[PDB]
Paper text:
Copper-containing nitrite reductases (CuNiRs) are found in all three kingdoms of life and play a major role in the denitrification branch of the global nitro­gen cycle where nitrate is used in place of di­oxy­gen as an electron acceptor in respiratory energy metabolism. The catalytic type-2 copper center (T2Cu) is located at the interface of the adjacent monomers and is ‘hard-wired’ to the electron-donating type-1 copper center (T1Cu) via neighboring residues that form a Cys–His electron-transfer (ET) bridge. The two active-site residues, AspCAT and HisCAT around the T2Cu, are involved in substrate binding and catalysis with both residues starting in the deprotonated state prior to substrate-binding events. The hexameric structure observed for the N-terminal cupredoxin-tethered three-domain CuNiR from two strains of [name] suggests that it is likely to offer an advantage for these organisms.
Residue numbers in the entry:
A (entry chain A): 26 to 448
B (entry chain C): 26 to 449
C (entry chain B): 27 to 448
The structure:
């Protein structure tokens, strides 16, 4: 799996013994915690040396072990497939350390892990929730209605956060117009909002990209009209101070201004945006997470997310496509701070629209593309064959902060394009 | 200015009461500080939970409030326009917290905020301070004179720093030659310099980009000649160790090697460079700031700056242009460490010279371009209509570290391109 | 001229106001002797420890720091150790020298000897790659990779446990033609603790081959895949934690040549940038160990070309001749940081943007952003001689081991660059 079940153990002294102590998740501060895993899950165990003796973790029946960690903070991670149901000791093999207390149980339970019933609204934008290509048609007046909504959202399994959104989801609505169109934008700020909200479209020309006309009090409405003068794939975002705050909380989306031709014909389109959340408590902490101002202004986030939540594009709203289809992903970074090294594991980009230019010729045969915050791009590729294709920021530590998505495509394991064994 | 006046409050216990405590700026460590703002200013208040009780901040007459912050370090920022002159209580609405001492005054004063008289040299390069297009002319020998000067500069309103510069400004002089030119470079290191200084031009071919010939002792002079073989927009920087130190302190600039044709004709040109400063004390601290080596080598800066100073391109040397003009910005990142997501709020780049290639066809209709440290680019756009256009690194937390500039363009508020209300 | 660096923190020790050494051969020593060889460039970083006013001065070099006042206030200075002998570094602030702020710089004749190595050399020579494939038809190509866990020389008195393809970092340079059918054998060495795998960015299907190559120690997996698209592709291990497998050294480049081949060039080089996340700071001697909290927080200690400090300066530098066109295949294993790749004293004639081998290259480029899991191609003509220096232009990474040399014999002064006026 590309979504391993992760457990962090720190060695130390508790309850009169030399033990493993759980870090984060369902095992925080528990001594020799039981690691509950479901049959067939991939298990990642991070061992961190707490007190400075020599330590490993060993599981005999999986021939799985860490390396020996010697100094304080010295770490070793290992993984395995929980293929066998039952109870298995994890223990330290260093002389006497197991006798001294360094031992817990891995419990592998049959059947699939249930989802933890959510407590807050699902704020994840489905990646299939966008308008399709506009017909060929004349330029015209297009009315767009945006509502700024502050609301608690399900950030992770067992963890919530107060999102600020366009229309109660992250990212906001995918806006699709034709170059030459006149956009009549209505911004309604919900009555229950504490904050003023606004919108800056990177595809609008004039003060604040519409921000200077859309500073909207709670329960109020602003209306701005602007001409879509330039074709492109544009991030829009709130532009009420603190703008970084409004952005991290989830107030970003994409505006496609289609060129006169339309974009190249493609079978299937997807809407994906990357952003960061800056919480007081580390990634994996249960309960209501809260915003950490010092982390926000210093660019030290805890969550890296596709479409608003951990599991957004894996559990709650994954991407589905069919072999033979050409796929387009509209990909933008709300941010507010980090440049994505956007990549799809198992695929190569046939076309990449450089710096989100829809008028310059796209680059061809590209593995990975840098997308800045307040930037967007378009990638397309042909699904020649089946598999689970995985969306990542290839700054891959961000896997361990919630940043991973699935493109699910039914087809055989083995064909002429990729198979096990030789010809 | 729409530039927000910012105040940070930490909740805690002081003077035997549960209070707000000021963080940084003119309010550092003051309990229930008076927040002085001028009529019509935009006010940003950052509330940070200090001790771990439930808190907000409320201002009744502005219907302005934070969210409730519960745990230690839990934060909520809110803003509003200081539209009414007078005195207004900010207070915590949690049961009993106001009675317990959580209350201060917002003072909204008539008239415009005065600027603090500066203490140190203005080290900000005006963005209009560059040579215009070279005529059509033959390749020739061009003598360039650079002087490396160490000097105290006005980093912010009430805060100074010891800059290292080419010719007493940040960025250094804009150097403009034609491909094929022979450059006769004289580097004079001022008598009063403590450090050796040098120059590496990204547009020069050979040892250290000229650095191996320009290691200049204080009071001394080096002369190097080099041929401008390749057209491009090149960052030059000091290359005396620690190079990152020489760069953060302000020793970076742009060399344009014009292609034979010249660059496309445009109405107005601008010179902008982004860099970082790594200070012991946080952004917003008054007095003489000093360099923090552990922050520099760990890439944890306090200041993100256009042309050397906070307010460089907003207060002291903003950009001015007229509706209808095509504008070119020569934009480079001295760094030394951070990639800029360069963007102008309210405009789209008609042309972007990707990776500073002046010979490859530019990209078209681009919102935002990544520029690496030791990289530069060219963007142009037509000012279709009026406004204050805002230069940013779209890693927008860097707003809160001094990184913002203004392009001022007078014209009506409402025209056919953007206006309030629906279409007519 | 890769500077010898010494860090001094001011403080109180042995009943005196002193300099205290930080890292290297001088960690925690009071008024440490700074041993330097004739003609070396010396960088001294002064950091204020206790909060009095301080500088460091060396009279016979007219070299000094600035005065540093507050706690953590810093000043670095450098000079060329041109004169052999012993020279006092001291604080010039009133009475501070008398109070104990004084040590000796010792400048010794002759070149610094190399530290005898303790662990295997894990640095890939940048010249160790297959040359251009002839013009030829698509065919079946068998590639053999072995995943080897082994102790390597991270720095000249510092070791680390590397995970590698074939015992070097980066892994083998794989070179095929578009249309080729790749028969990949992955052998995981018997002595490995971890499962290993490979994801090629140039393969189409589950995990870029990772889903077929999860290989137990002492075992072998075989996957076949068609190189459908030309490009310069990073490959890496894709066994969890993938970031862990990557930082430890499991990354390399696959060139899928376009039908034409790449433009003719005199000399080719293989360079990859990555990070290592150690418990102890950069410059610490002995067995370094991995710091998980630093890895997931993206706070590395080592920024490296081809696996080691001195990889492309001391142990395996780049060599070329004036007049030659040079191509560098440059990729970022990472796992986390985007390189601002630049060669000091050169300009890129061609840059293959985002590693596109089919789209026209950009021309006359100083510096190119390469993301982690990204690669590019740059070429340039060596018009003249010199030591050309490969850097990430996020230049604080110099102070974490990230620097390489391209050595090219030729005169100091020619018509392209020289000392006097013309
Ligand atoms: Cu143990
Ligand atoms: Cu908002
Ligand atoms: Cu924006
Ligand atoms: Cu309170
Ligand atoms: Cu300098
Ligand atoms: Cu440089
Ligand atoms: Cu002293
Ligand atoms: Cu591996
Ligand atoms: Cu990859």
């Amino acid at each position: 799996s590309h979504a391993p079940v992760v457990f962090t153990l720190r060695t130390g002294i508790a309850e009169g013994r030399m033990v493993y102590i759980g870090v984060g998740g369902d095992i925080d501060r528990q001594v020799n915690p039981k690691l509950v895993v479901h049959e067939g899950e991939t298990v990642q165990i991070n061992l961190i040396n707490g007190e400075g003796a020599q330590h490993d973790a060993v599981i005999d029946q999986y021939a799985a072990r860490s390396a020996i960690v010697s100094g304080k903070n010295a770490s070793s991670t290992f993984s395995f497939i929980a293929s066998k149901v039952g109870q298995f000791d994890y223990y330290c093999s260093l002389p006497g350390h197991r006798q001294a207390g360094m031992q817990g149980v891995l419990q592998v339970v049959p059947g699939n892990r249930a989802e933890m019933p959510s407590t807050a609204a699902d704020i994840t934008r489905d990646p299939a929730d966008l308008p399709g290509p506009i017909g060929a048609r004349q330029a015209k007046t297009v009315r767009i209605d945006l509502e700024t909504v502050e609301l608690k959202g399900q950030l992770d399994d067992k963890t919530t956060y107060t999102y600020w959104t366009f229309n109660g989801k992250v990212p906001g609505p995918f806006l699709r117009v034709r170059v030459g169109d006149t956009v009549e934008l209505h911004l309604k700020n919900a009555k229950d909002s504490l904050m003023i909200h606004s919108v800056d479209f990177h595809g609008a020309t004039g003060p604040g990209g519409a921000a200077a006309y859309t500073q909207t009090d709670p329960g109020a409405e602003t209306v701005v009209t602007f001409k879509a003068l330039v074709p492109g794939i544009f991030v829009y975002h709130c532009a009420t101070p603190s703008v970084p705050n409004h952005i991290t909380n989830g107030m970003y989306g994409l505006l496609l201004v289609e060129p006169e031709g339309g974009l190249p014909q493609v079978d299937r389109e997807f809407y994906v945006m990357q952003g960061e959340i800056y919480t007081v408590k580390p990634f994996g902490t249960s309960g209501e997470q809260e915003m950490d101002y010092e982390k926000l202004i210093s660019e030290k986030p805890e969550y890296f997310l596709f479409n608003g939540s951990v599991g957004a594009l894996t559990r709650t709203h994954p991407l589905y496509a069919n072999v033979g289809e050409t796929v387009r992903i509209f990909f933008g970074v709300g941010g507010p701070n980090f440049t994505s090294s956007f990549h799809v594991i198992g695929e190569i980009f046939d076309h990449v629209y450089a710096l989100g230019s829809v008028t310059s010729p796209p680059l061809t045969g590209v593995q990975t593309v840098s997308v800045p915050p307040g930037g967007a791009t378009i990638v397309d590729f042909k699904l020649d064959r089946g598999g689970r294709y995985v969306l990542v920021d290839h700054a891959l530590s961000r896997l361990d902060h919630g940043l991973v998505g699935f493109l699910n495509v039914d087809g055989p394991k083995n064909d002429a394009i990729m198979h096990e064994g030789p010809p």
